[PDB]
Amino acid sequence: ALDDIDRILVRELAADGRATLSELATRAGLSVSAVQSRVRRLESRGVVQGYSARINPEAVGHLLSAFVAITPLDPSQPDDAPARLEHIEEVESCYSVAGEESYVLLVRVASARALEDLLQRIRTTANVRTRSTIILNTFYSDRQHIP
Amino acid sequence: ALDDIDRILVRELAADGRATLSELATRAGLSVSAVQSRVRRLESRGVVQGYSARINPEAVGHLLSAFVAITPLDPSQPDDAPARLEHIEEVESCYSVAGEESYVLLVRVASARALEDLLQRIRTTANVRTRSTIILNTFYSDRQHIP
Amino acid sequence: ALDDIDRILVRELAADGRATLSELATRAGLSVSAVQSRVRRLESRGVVQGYSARINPEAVGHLLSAFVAITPLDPSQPDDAPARLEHIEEVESCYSVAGEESYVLLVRVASARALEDLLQRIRTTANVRTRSTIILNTFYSDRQHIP
Amino acid sequence: ALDDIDRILVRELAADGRATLSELATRAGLSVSAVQSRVRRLESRGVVQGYSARINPEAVGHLLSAFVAITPLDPSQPDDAPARLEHIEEVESCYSVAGEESYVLLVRVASARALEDLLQRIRTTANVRTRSTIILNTFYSDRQHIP
Amino acid sequence: ALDDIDRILVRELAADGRATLSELATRAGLSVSAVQSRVRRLESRGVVQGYSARINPEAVGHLLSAFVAITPLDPSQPDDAPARLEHIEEVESCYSVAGEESYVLLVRVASARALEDLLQRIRTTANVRTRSTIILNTFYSDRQHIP
Amino acid sequence: ALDDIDRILVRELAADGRATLSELATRAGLSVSAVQSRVRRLESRGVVQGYSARINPEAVGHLLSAFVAITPLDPSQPDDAPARLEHIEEVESCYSVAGEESYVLLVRVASARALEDLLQRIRTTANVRTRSTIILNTFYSDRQHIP
Amino acid sequence: ALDDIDRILVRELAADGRATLSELATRAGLSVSAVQSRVRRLESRGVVQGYSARINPEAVGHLLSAFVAITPLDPSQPDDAPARLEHIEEVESCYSVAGEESYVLLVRVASARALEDLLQRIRTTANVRTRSTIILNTFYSDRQHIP
Amino acid sequence: ALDDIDRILVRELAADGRATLSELATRAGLSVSAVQSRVRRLESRGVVQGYSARINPEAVGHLLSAFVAITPLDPSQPDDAPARLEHIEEVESCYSVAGEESYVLLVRVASARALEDLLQRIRTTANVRTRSTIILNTFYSDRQHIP
What we know:
The structure is a homooctamer.
Chain A lengths: L3 H12 L5 H8 L3 H13 L3 E8 L8 E9 L8 H5 L5 E8 L4 E7 L2 H14 L2 E13 L7
Antiparallel strand pairs in A: 2-4, 2-5, 3-4
Helix pairs in contact in A: 2-3
Protein name (chains A, B, C, D, E, F, G, H): Leucine-responsive regulatory protein
Pfam families (chains A, B, C, D, E, F, G, H): AsnC_trans_reg (PF01037), HTH_24 (PF13412)
GO molecular function (chains A, B, C, D, E, F, G, H): amino acid binding; DNA binding; sequence-specific DNA binding
């Protein structure tokens, strides 16, 4: 189940993470107390994982973003590249994929020259070849969809 | 233009977008009023683009996710694709990209058959060839970094 | 459910489609009557779809096999290429795929020159571009696996 | 060397691999003995490679299927890959192929996570890079053609 | 249908297309008349397609040679390309090919600027994209093999 | 120089390698003796290298032709692959190239299965990776052009 | 001819474009008058075309450089893209090439977002598709070599 | 840090690297001393990297130029390639690059055979595969832009 009182709830919270427990209950058709409980059970079972403000990465000094596709060099070694790159803070996302490469990373960085640095560090730390695709512009990002 | 105080606020709001104004105040050593007003300045400039609950896409029924790279079947018609795809709700992100392809989308769907139907809708609404890379697992995503 | 009397049954029938209703029941641990009923319910619900002898295609005049990957040319038209190629007998399999192309076909043919013919016919009949990969040798084929 | 009679037998056994010897006899206009003995000749020469029940892979739990093209991480060591992959039961077929890649496998698995684990096993047991093409739907397969 | 005698004749005429009928006669152990008439049979069937002096392309002024692979800018219009390129004299060969491209040409020209002008003529007369592979040196060519 | 009495001469001999020393001199505007001398100096300085009949390779058992592109595996070893493959008779041409690969071969062979054999032999004898492109049809071949 | 008094002269001027007419003549072994004349005849016949200081493009606001490979969309139109892009100042170099694309440009730009702009302008002004490769770092550039 | 005056100086020295100090002075409205000293500041900071005569590569005997993209045969050994190629004089530039390849070189040579010999030297001194793109014509190059 995902009871569809919760459908409207997660819908509302995806468009507005600061939407107040009060103003939810009006559009939501429940008691300020019922809503508040729902929202708490939704986090407990992992339906909402977190609340985040969406930061413009340019405004914070990240003028170059890229997908970096990686493939381990040695298949006789354990394939743990996500755990090995997890400490590198400019990797924002890491996915295993069915494609040409084993994983895809999304990475943000100060400039073209910093990307070269980061790639050398990704290569030597995980034990991977890199193939990168530079993002020129983000038209929209995390528009979460609740059916 | 971003001082040390704004850096703390954007960093905390990244870690927790429901942080109360009083909690932010006592972490930045300001009054609740000075916090509110600094947060509002951030919002009206580029810096904070909104606030979102992070929803588990598996729990709402998106069991398959994919990257889809797209390129114009005919590269004359000036480039429309992000605008025209904006009304497909299963597209969650859209980036233009350097290299052989012009945009990369991330898309979320219920199953393999729903992925085929969606790739058709994308080919036809943007007039585009598609190359799809199914995601097998997300190790971590959205982990925002304030330098 | 797939009751695992049926596991051994489908296992046995995948290795030997002519295995007799008799000799099954010994290895199968059931009455010749029980087995015979099982096997009949297995076909009714679509678990076994057919029985086929495996024909060597070289021995029958098919000296060249190929995967032919296809993508419709016009995405404003209905995408019905499987139904349109279904009458072409040298297409042995047709799959929709998540990749560079929309579908993959496996095709068998008398020679390199007949492949060129077949491709021109696939192109004009479905409305598709073709990309083909020639099979040099089949090491093994349909080794069906029952967990 | 294949006369008209053998053509009828291989065609009927393709359409129905459990056809009884008497049914084959009366369709070829032979005795049941002459059928048996012609069928046995077909089997001992190249022509009929075995008989198999066609199992629905979704009903036994293989909900994901994929093509995986593989190429040697080091193309010296003489080519071993089909032999070494023979003991991975989720590989159902293996073809060598002309072009940039050396073999194409068809593989069947329970889910996305089981696909990642399998691609690891394949990279390591054959020492190979992999490029994966997930299948979304089978419109028809195995439809054998006797000219 | 090719006996041992025809094999000797086609092999000698491969090594030396000006071999005199008497020289061929005494090598096949036939009369000059039986040679003539066997050679004529070869010519009127598929077997001998003509006779050519092998010219040094550098000595007549073709200092640059290249392979050009071509693919239709629009793959509907049924395939015309070999017919339409037949009247460009600098194209010396034309093969259709499996894979991503549809034909491969070998082309010979006086210089780099004459190569650019020719690639334009090819793009426009066949309506095709081109991918060019310049030849640096011919180690041996045309070495025909009669098994 | 290539005196353009020789232009017509090499032109005539490229279209007809058996064209008689007699019938040349009429179209050629010279004495049967002058022509005969020209032709002999043309072979001496390497302008005409040979005379060959053009054999249909299908008719002689070569039902599959391919370009096979090769690149040495070890760049610390001398790069002598042309000299090492020269004894393999099914390689009809070998070129060094400016492209993705170091050389391109044209190869003819009895079937798809024989190609696989030949490739394994090319790999182990030169020390090369292979990438092959199968020829489906030859529209025309060695139309030599004399400006 | 390039008299090899001129070899040393052009060698000297390639390493140092401001090298004085005086200090040349010492290392150069000529009269300050002879050198001065040489240098003037060298510019007249186009051996030296110009003198330029080498500007760091980062230092001047060009934080992102790229090769942009282009191919005209319509081969029935005159192919004049160099003349059409010549007014766009961020194109620093334009070459016709033998490859996948018709031309290669080197382009410099303020950022990733400005590159997207520039590409849209290259597309609509010449009539071309674009494929771009981002330069991460220049290790060395115009080391001119005089044999 | 670059004022309006420095912009004029770098722009004029781009157009003419032999401009005399007095000519620069009267264009910037400064004394010859203030010019010298501003030019020296530019040189000692990043801004002016040297001065070069632009030599016609055809007139000194480099009749063939090419882009060569290179990628490590083994991507572990930390990346050495620019350092190791620095001593090959026919390499004029070296850039690292995002995407499938790691560096792009521009190379100049006397002929096709000298290009093959050079690609060998490059494969072996950096341990790299190469992909070559011959240049047919330079329409304009080095046209520096000060914004």
